Amino acid sequence: GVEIETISPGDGRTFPKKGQTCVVHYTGMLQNGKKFDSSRDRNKPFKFRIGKQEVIKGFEEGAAQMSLGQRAKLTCTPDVAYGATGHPGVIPPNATLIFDVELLNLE
């Protein structure tokens, strides 16, 4: 389950498609917890493409449901990202993930 909470401004029409390399200022957040990941710290805004299952499934479905300039807010279910496994040391099992995602992309 991917739930989108978009901070309004953007264009609403430039949607990511297959084979398009896109640029996202993401920001990770644990529900009832602190941050765990941020592109704002490294300031390299994470160039990635669509259609290769590179990212987790909760972040993948929310990427296609945004547009250029928009500022959404993800709520990733445990089963789509790590809730069975848990990323060792960083993500516990059965974790519900929160993301601040802005789509300032190319292509």
UniProtKB/Swiss-Prot annotation:
InterPro entries: FKBP-type_PPIase, PPIase_dom_sf, PPIase_FKBP_dom
EC code(s) of this entry: 5.2.1.8
Main location (coarse class): cytoplasm
Catalyses which reaction(s): [protein]-peptidylproline (omega=180) = [protein]-peptidylproline (omega=0)
Keyword Cytoplasm: yes
Domain PPIase FKBP-type: 19-107
Gene Ontology BP terms: 'de novo' protein folding; calcium-mediated signaling; insulin secretion involved in cellular response to glucose stimulus; negative regulation of calcium-mediated signaling; negative regulation of heart rate; negative regulation of insulin secretion involved in cellular response to glucose stimulus; negative regulation of release of sequestered calcium ion into cytosol; neuronal action potential propagation
Pfam families: FKBP_C
Superkingdom classification of source: Eukaryota
Disulfide bonds listed in the record: none
Entry keyword set: Cytoplasm, Isomerase, Rotamase, Sarcoplasmic reticulum
Tissues where the protein occurs: Detected in heart muscle (at protein level). Isoform 1 and isoform 2 are ubiquitous with highest levels in brain and thymus.
GO cellular component: calcium channel complex; cytoplasm; membrane; sarcoplasmic reticulum membrane; Z disc
GO molecular function, one term: peptidyl-prolyl cis-trans isomerase activity
Localization (cell): Cytoplasm; Sarcoplasmic reticulum
Documented activity regulation: Inhibited by both FK506 and rapamycin.
Keyword DNA-binding recorded: no
Protein family (similarity comment): Belongs to the FKBP-type PPIase family. FKBP1 subfamily.
Physiological role: Has the potential to contribute to the immunosuppressive and toxic effects of FK506 and rapamycin. PPIases accelerate the folding of proteins. It catalyzes the cis-trans isomerization of proline imidic peptide bonds in oligopeptides.
Subunit structure comment from the entry: Identified in a complex composed of RYR2, FKBP1B, PKA catalytic subunit, PRKAR2A, AKAP6, and the protein phosphatases PP2A and PP1. Interacts directly with RYR2.
Protein name from the UniProt record: Peptidyl-prolyl cis-trans isomerase FKBP1B
